Design a protein around this nucleic acid. Structure first.
Ligand SMILES: [Mg+2]
Ligand SMILES: [Mg+2]
Ligand SMILES: [Mg+2]
Ligand SMILES: [Mg+2]
Ligand SMILES: [Mg+2]
Ligand SMILES: [Mg+2]
Ligand SMILES: [Mg+2]
Ligand SMILES: [Mg+2]
Ligand SMILES: [Mg+2]
Lengths: 134, 60, 144, 182
RNA sequence: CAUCCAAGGAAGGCAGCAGGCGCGCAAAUUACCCAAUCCUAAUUCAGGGAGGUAGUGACAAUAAAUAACGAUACAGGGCCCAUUCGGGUCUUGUAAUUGGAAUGAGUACAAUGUAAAUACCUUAACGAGGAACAACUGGAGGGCAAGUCUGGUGCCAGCAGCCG
């Protein structure tokens, strides 16, 4: 009596982005939310596409449980999904990796420190070294 | 004598009143229950129809 | 018919007549002259802190025989000195000499209330803590 | 700097706050319909006052005037859709004749009481507040859910609730577990 | 009005976001990030304390928990009449009696949410008996709803917006 059933309302094709947009209306009694990955797979064999060219987000299990609503897109190919989707969705789905970024404060500090020096820091390092030498 | 102490001393009656402790009570229901209690006590359990309602009638 | 003109082109004298008559009120005159900022102990201020100079009690009027426990406070914002009232029963001892006290209005539009002569300000807080919390022993004076 | 969204007051305390007859009437209406505070009666009176202000403003306008026709029948249809105004008197002059008790009657509280699935008005209040009644497979934990005429037929206990058919709940499940263990 | 100073010199502009001193009755965290709105640039990609997200926040504003229902003992009204009765025949309250339910406020597997996280919506597993999971703030002479009850002080202490 689980029977998670899925529906795609307001579906619009879109070769502008080589996608198909829709709102995901998932009816699921006696159950919590649908754990996006599982619903991505459900849409994957629903629309005859791989589990990689399918994305869902913006979900909201309505008040009182049961129904839930989100937004979903199905891309014509996995490559188009790779080259059109935001980075954070490509990180959620495991098809990309979180970029090794220093924190914003450190980046700004380093930017100002680079501001202090005109041109490359090659000459100034040796100049300062031989300066404190004497 | 005429006056039992220094007359103009501040906090006199407060100082010498007998400290009587609060009497412990059952919980008084609050919210909708309190309004229901008041409605029952006044308009379906009319106690003293004579004269006025006389809520809080002194015992004499 | 009446004292005021009634013609369709008499807006000017009607307006200036009202404008000259408005000074007869007290609220309008105070608001426009701005006497509150210049003369009152507080300039349009509901509350003000001050320093207790000494600790006085003031006798009441004829029909009421008692001594209301006051306190002379020099205001910190400008330096004026005003008497103020310590409201409740055992609160005189709570406020000690030379501690910061937050005086408030006395509720009668800057005029003496009841039988207390020459006072126009309550006492709400002392040394950062409120008098009502001290009087019911909810908080205690920090004694700094 | 973002465009604000407008909060607005929804009640108005009476100017004479201490009227014996009015206080007794307010307590009557609070006890009859299990209202938590007397702010509920103020809110219904404020809604009724807005409705009456609109009705009187439209009445002042001349008969057969586009404003009168359009917004008068709009208000009429809205009120009959709520259900407070009976279909017999869709005239915009009986709108001025509505009483606060009329809007009080259409609350989901009193409707659950009328349907009988709650045997007491306070029982209706608690049953609504415990997420049991669902107006069309959608629970409403709010007593002041103004039930409209088109949807009153769809009040019943929700499926997730034990009354609509589900697991019983904390106390019953614990008692059953204790009985099974011992 | 200030800062470093090797006393020769050098460098200043928060009524930007933070934060500090002061002032005053009076007003927030040196937080996260370009996800969203957009903007700049050679221009998708870089950048943006613009901005958004959170932190504090009883400025204001909305909805709304703090119990609900029985079965018993003390009672009251419509009563079959009125042999005193009185069954309570018909109901409505009061009792530290007494039972079974329902539920959140909290915790918390998860998943949703989000740039990432909180938080909300959903939901496992716990989570109500004095349901101590305990609602306060003012007032009870009049204005103005509610005491000419008990004790204390006796024109003191104090109350009182006004009359008192
Ligand atoms: Mg600043
Ligand atoms: Mg800003
Ligand atoms: Mg402030
Ligand atoms: Mg907080
Ligand atoms: Mg509580
Ligand atoms: Mg009290
Ligand atoms: Mg008092
Ligand atoms: Mg008293
Ligand atoms: Mg009265």
């Amino acid at each position: 009596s689980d029977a998670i059933t899925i529906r795609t309302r307001k579906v619009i094709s879109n070769p502008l982005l080589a996608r198909k947009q829709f709102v995901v209306d998932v009816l699921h009694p006696n159950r919590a939310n649908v754990s996006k990955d599982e619903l991505r797979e459900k849409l994957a064999e629903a629309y005859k596409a791989e589990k990689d060219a399918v994305s869902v987000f913006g979900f909201r299990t309505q008040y009182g449980g049961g129904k839930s609503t989100g937004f979903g897109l199905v891309y014509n190919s996995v490559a188009d999904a790779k080259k059109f989707e935001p980075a954070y969705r490509l990180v959620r789905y495991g098809l990309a990796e979180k970029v090794e970024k220093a924190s914003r404060q450190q980046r700004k500090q380093r930017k100002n420190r680079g501001k202090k020096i005109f041109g490359t820091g090659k000459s100034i390092a040796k100049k300062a070294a031989r300066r404190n030498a004497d | 004598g005429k006056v039992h102490g220094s007359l103009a001393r501040a906090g006199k009656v407060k100082s010498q009143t007998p400290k009587v402790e609060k009497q412990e009570k059952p919980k008084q229901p609050k919210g909708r229950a309190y309004k229901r209690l008041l409605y029952t006590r006044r308009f379906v359990n009319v106690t003293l129809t004579n004269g006025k309602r006389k809520m809080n009638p002194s015992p004499s | 018919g009446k004292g005021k003109p009634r013609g369709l082109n008499s807006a000017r004298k009607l307006r200036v007549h009202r404008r000259n008559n408005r000074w007869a009120e007290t609220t309008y005159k105070k608001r426009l002259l701005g006497t509150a900022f210049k003369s009152s102990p507080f300039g349009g201020s509901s509350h003000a802190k001050g320093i207790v100079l000494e600790k006085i009690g003031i006798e009441s009027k004829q029909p009421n025989s008692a001594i209301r426990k006051c306190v002379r406070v020099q205001l910190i914002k400008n330096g004026k000195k005003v008497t103020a009232f310590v409201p409740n029963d055992g609160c005189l001892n709570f406020v000690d000499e030379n501690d910061e006290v937050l005086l408030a209005g006395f509720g009668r539009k800057g005029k003496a209330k009841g039988d207390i002569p020459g006072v126009r300000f309550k006492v709400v807080k002392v040394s950062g803590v409120s008098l009502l919390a001290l009087w019911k022993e909810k908080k205690e004076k920090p004694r700094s | 700097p973002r465009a604000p969204r407008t909060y607005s007051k929804t009640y108005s305390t009476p100017k004479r706050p201490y009227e014996s007859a009015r206080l007794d009437a307010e307590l009557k209406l609070a006890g009859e319909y299990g209202l938590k505070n007397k702010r509920e009666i103020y809110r219904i009176s404020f809604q009724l006052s807005k409705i009456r202000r609109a009705a009187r403003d439209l009445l002042t306008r001349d008969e057969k005037d586009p404003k009168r026709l359009f917004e008068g029948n709009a208000l009429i249809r809205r009120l009959v859709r709520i259900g407070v105004l009976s279909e017999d008197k869709k005239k915009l002059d009986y709108v001025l004749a509505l009483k606060v008790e009329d809007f009080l009657e259409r609350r989901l509280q009193t409707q659950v009481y009328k349907l009988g699935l709650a045997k007491s008005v306070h029982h209706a209040r608690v049953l609504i507040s415990q997420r049991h009644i669902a107006v069309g497979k959608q629970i409403v934990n709010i007593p002041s859910f103004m039930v409209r005429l088109e949807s009153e037929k769809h009040i019943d206990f929700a499926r997730t609730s034990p009354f609509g058919g589900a697991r019983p709940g904390r106390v019953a499940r614990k008692r059953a577990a204790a009985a099974g263990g011992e």
